[PDB]
A paper describes a structure:
Here, we report the crystal structure of engineered S8-eSRK and S8-SP11 complex derived from S8-haplotype in B. rapa, which has a common overall structure with the S9-eSRK–S9-SP11 complex but an entirely different mode of the ligand recognition. Comprehensive protein engineering experiments yielded S8-eSRK containing 11 mutations (S8-meSRK) in two lectin domains that improved the expression of recombinant protein in the insect cell system. The crystal structure of the S8-meSRK ectodomain and chemically synthesized S8-SP11 complex was determined at 2.6 Å resolution. The complex, composed of a 2:2 S8-meSRK–S8-SP11 heterotetramer, forms a turned A-like structure. S8-meSRK consists of two lectin domains, an EGF-like domain, and a PAN domain with six disulfide bonds and three sugar chains. In the two SP11-binding sites of S8-meSRK, site 1 is 793.0 Å2 of the concaved surface area formed by all HV regions, and site 2 is a 444.1 Å2 crescent moon–like surface mainly formed by the HV II region. The β2–β3 loop of S8-SP11 forms a hydrogen bond network with the SP11-binding site 1 of S8-meSRK. The amino group of Lys63 in S8-SP11, located on the highly acidic concave surface of S8-meSRK, stabilizes the interaction. In SP11-binding site 2, the aromatic ring of Tyr275 in S8-meSRK is stacked with the plane of Asn65 side chain in S8-SP11, which forms three hydrogen bonds with Asn271, Glu277, and Ser293 of S8-meSRK. In the center of the dimerization surface in the S8-meSRK complex, His297, Val313, and Asn314 are in tight contact with the same residues of another S8-meSRK molecule via van der Waals interactions or hydrogen bonds.
Author numbering:
A (entry chain B): 33 to 93, 96 to 110, 116 to 121, 129 to 146, 151 to 436
B (entry chain A): 33 to 112, 116 to 122, 129 to 147, 152 to 434
C (entry chain C), D (entry chain D): 29 to 74
Amino acid sequence: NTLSSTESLTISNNRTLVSPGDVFELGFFTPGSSSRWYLGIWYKKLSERTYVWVANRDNPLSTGTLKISGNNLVLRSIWSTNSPVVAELLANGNFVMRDSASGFLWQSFDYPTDTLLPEMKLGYDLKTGRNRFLTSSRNSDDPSSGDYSYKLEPRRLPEFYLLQGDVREHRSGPWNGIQFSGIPEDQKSSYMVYNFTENSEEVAYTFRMTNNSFYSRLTINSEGYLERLTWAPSSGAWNVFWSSPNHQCDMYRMCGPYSYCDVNTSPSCNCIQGFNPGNVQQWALRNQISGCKRRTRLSCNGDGFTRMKNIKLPDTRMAIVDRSIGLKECEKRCLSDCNCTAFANADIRNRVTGCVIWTGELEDMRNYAEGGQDLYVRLAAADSRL
Amino acid sequence: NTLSSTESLTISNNRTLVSPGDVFELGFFTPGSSSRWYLGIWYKKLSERTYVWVANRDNPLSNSTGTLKISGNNLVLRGDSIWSTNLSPVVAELLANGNFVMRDSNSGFLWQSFDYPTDTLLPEMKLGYDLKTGRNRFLTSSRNSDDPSSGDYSYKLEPRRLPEFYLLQGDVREHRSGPWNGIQFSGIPEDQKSSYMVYNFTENSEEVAYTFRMTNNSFYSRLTINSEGYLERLTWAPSSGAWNVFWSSPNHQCDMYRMCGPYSYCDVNTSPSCNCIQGFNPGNVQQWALRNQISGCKRRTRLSCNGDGFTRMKNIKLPDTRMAIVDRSIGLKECEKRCLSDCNCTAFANADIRNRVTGCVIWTGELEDMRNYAEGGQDLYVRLAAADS
Amino acid sequence: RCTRGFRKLGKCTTLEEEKCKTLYPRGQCTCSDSKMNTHSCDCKSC
Amino acid sequence: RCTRGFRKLGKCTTLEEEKCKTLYPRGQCTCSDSKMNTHSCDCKSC
Ligand SMILES: *[C@@H]1O[C@H](CO)[C@@H](O)[C@H](O)[C@H]1NC(C)=O
Ligand SMILES: *[C@@H]1O[C@H](CO)[C@@H](O)[C@H](O)[C@H]1NC(C)=O
Ligand SMILES: *[C@@H]1O[C@H](CO)[C@@H](O)[C@H](O)[C@H]1NC(C)=O
Ligand SMILES: *[C@@H]1O[C@H](CO)[C@@H](O)[C@H](O)[C@H]1NC(C)=O
Ligand SMILES: *[C@@H]1O[C@H](CO)[C@@H](O)[C@H](O)[C@H]1NC(C)=O
């Protein structure tokens, strides 16, 4: 009953629900000299307030309370969730509306602010149509909506974008079975596992703790960097474990089409083998937006492929996937289609490797000194020897 | 007379000085929504105004009135005093290169704008220390593109025994150039094959200063520290009608000052960035495990002074030169002996990377603010216990 | 969703703002300053 | 003109401001937000 609320009401005076296991706590709060009030969830056991959810981040509430009004949680209506229904806060920080099975009627998890906790879902639901994405707060003492979001793009081959407003600043790349190149998780972590769920009802990224002495989260901070912050018992602060983007080669289309950004070269931009700079005067001034043009025209049948190693796969707007075939067939299928410009494996670790095919321009590519993937790029027969 | 000012006045109503060559033009101007007026130089042939100097960058002319005249031994600028130089017949002359000098009408300029820079280093201008005056000439950024007042960043030489530049926000060191190796600073990454310019770092009795010169004058190039605190080379070629950012500094976190702790180096190819020097291990292993690497590394084996050796790092940005001593008269084999002979010596390196020229730099204390590169950089010999060599 | 655009080193300028307008012959195209000393030309309409 | 200090990934936090002081508690240490998603601890007086 100290994590649930029924006929009762929670005033700014002064009751707080607390999750089973001590980890999270719902209540009211005012940050800084704001004299503004918000309904939110935080880590209970931490001296410095770290907020993981907020009910009214841009409808700021010295009175304001919320209880149940018919079949809904209303907050006074500053905010509301459009039989005896109980609102409960579970052990993972999800604030639920249920009947007294997980047939919840409303989750806070479906309405993220700037943070992804373990077992929260970053991605969309095809059944309901809701896309769950992170939106930055304005700054550390103001949880209202900032200018940055990190959002899964619904498409045949989904990938994440970091946006400033509606401007794409950075692109995660597609999932490869293990990871997105731009969510650079520690794959040998001892306290975390990561998952990308993709099926006919939802596609979403999630992570889970293997050891609950640690806390970890994903937050996109006020300047528009996505970071993983881990709290170890061996410290009294959140440590930034990784940060993204963290190189100009990670900035969306730092380079032009058919070139790839390389952190070990001057200039950063390099033509794919078989391609030449599109605008030679611009490139000599290191204006490389022109990208590269193929030097030998394609002949469709009898075209060939050059293999790129250690690459981040190009923007997936015009990619089609077939996970049921392998690379030899994928090449055959790419060849037959005169507009196929490149193909790659869908999932390296499976015995059926799947096929990804691009038409159109190859965009937003960078390489890596280790890791990355193969990309087979279509060339005229002559140049295909490169 | 197009070019000089004498017993006359220059006011917003309305004369300007132009240079022999038509590249620059001095006069008044006011930008954007603001009603503030300023005196300065700009490129004349450029429809978008690019300002290379501003006398009263932080003392704006209040109303729409102001005057620049000579008054005895000084250039003055009044608004019905806002700015003035301080100090036979004197004339204020704007040179071909964009330098507004004060002359004896009868080299030995009394004053020059080149010595009082704003945010821009022009060709032939000097970035650094004038030993005759004791003045440090350095860049300070503007508040933004619309407001030429003084911003929060500077790029300034630290004229030590082995000098280097620091990019500062206020007084906080954000980035560091590295020392001069004979042809470059690692943090001022020029194209050493440029068709149209050359570069020099001068270290002598009169100055310690960086400078570049145009080799084909159909090109404009400059160094400018922009309002966010990046040092950029912007080039204007005849072809396009825009300034092109040819390079930017710093451009990665591995360029930020002490992104890694002592005795480690930053690498753009690794996660995490910081890497112990060989023979060294993380200094706080629980922090390194959370990828907090401010601790840097500690050496594995204790030093013996005698019989110690060195591990070779290559492709390195040489560490912060505060505790560095340079003797350019001795080569690398003797540098090793001299470093071995003093147990405070933590590392040594060549002073000049060109072929057959040489020198010796020696560090004491922690090695700081290092990073590697896939190409270029230099060798650094780090002192290790003979076991670990 | 208009996808044409590019990214460059340095800050947005007024001449670059005119260059953003070349991406599409219709629509609202502008310059956005960004992190790591880059800017981009993108179009909210086309 | 004080010397030691450090740089980290991420923005300044209150906890970060505190760990800044324990460098030289005599001197004036402060946490500075910087570009490229870094902050630095630097102590002025010494
Ligand atoms: C979770 O991730 C692991 C990866 O280590 C994977 O083996 C497992 O099948 C995933 N399960 C779910 C339900 O996501
Ligand atoms: C959980 O973490 C602690 C310290 O990190 C470790 O000692 C313990 O073995 C971990 N639990 C498991 C099941 O490995
Ligand atoms: C300028 O640099 C060039 C190339 O290193 C060199 O030939 C010349 O001596 C330098 N000038 C001075 C004054 O050092
Ligand atoms: C200067 O550069 C331009 C552009 O490349 C070239 O056309 C011209 O001939 C050059 N002038 C000289 C004197 O080399
Ligand atoms: C090493 O450092 C100590 C510090 O006081 C100094 O006294 C000693 O002279 C130094 N070694 C040499 C060879 O100067």
